[PDB]
Amino acid sequence: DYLLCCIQHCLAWYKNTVIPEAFYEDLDDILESITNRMIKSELEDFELDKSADFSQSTSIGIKNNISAFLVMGVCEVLIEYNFSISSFSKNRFEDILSLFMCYKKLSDILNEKAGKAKTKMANKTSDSLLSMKFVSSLLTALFRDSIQSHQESLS
Amino acid sequence: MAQAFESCQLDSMVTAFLVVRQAALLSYADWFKASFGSTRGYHGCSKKALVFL
DNA sequence: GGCACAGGTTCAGAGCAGGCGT
DNA sequence: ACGCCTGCTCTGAACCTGTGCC
């Protein structure tokens, strides 16, 4: 999770200030691939919701709870990657939606399993890995953009 | 067969199948029902091992 | 009937109000 | 009336109950 966050943020830095030489051109495509294959991996590839019920006593449910938080963070760093590269591409905003759809499916699943026991699981209320930078620039464009060239992709 | 469905490769599967078939000449059916018991229910953890089979 | 927020309660100790030797 | 010791008052922390809602 954090490693993807690190690579993403270093990557954005590298594009922005350094460029104005094979490793980064590779890494762009690494992430693009990781996105495209993560898009169509529906938790039976990661053994979740049916093969696991994330029971925090069992070694399997605890391992599910570890890998689940990894992928939630992973999805988020890719939300960042997707948005960052492209100047408002409606394909890549659908990519962002799909990463969130995976994260949000893990969200409402872990809400179902947190609805039975007491609300002591503050591991689900662990911080996002996003630079505040991001939360600003996302919210900027979500609430304060009337630019019609962006507007179809932000809808 | 374990190696073959861990990697989900048909080459070693085909080898094992033809091996048991020539070993028969109903030992094929014996080995098949042995597979059906706690091998063929989960060849791989993913149920695409069934699709390759 | 269970699921959840708010209240008050017991604690546990810091740190100073004041009774008591010369 | 000044020095010495103690015990009381405040302060917040954590505990678990107590009651309202669906």
Annotate A71-105 with b (16+ C-beta within 10 A) or e (fewer): bbbbbbbbbbbbbbeeebeeebbebbebbeebbee
Cβ distance A59 to A46 under 8 Å? no
Annotate B1-12 with b (16+ C-beta within 10 A) or e (fewer): beebbeeeeeee
To one decimal place, what's the resolution in Å?
4.2
Instruction: Report yes or no: A94 at the B interface, CB cutoff 8 Å.
Output: no
Method by which the coordinates were obtained: cryo-EM
Q: What is the rounded distance in angstroms from the CA atom of residue B19 to the CA atom of residue B28?
A: 10
> Tokens 């953890």 identify what position?
B45
CA of A18, C1' of C22: distance in angstroms: 83
Q: Characterise A43 by phi-psi region: left (phi > 0), alpha (psi -120 to 50), beta (else).
A: left
Q: Are the beta carbons of A47 and B45 separated by less than 8 Å? A: yes
For helices A2-13 and A59-85, what crossing angle results, to 10°?
10
Question: Among candidates A135, A49, A10, A95, which has minimal Cα distance to A2?
Answer: A10
Copy the structure tokens of residue A84. 């960052």
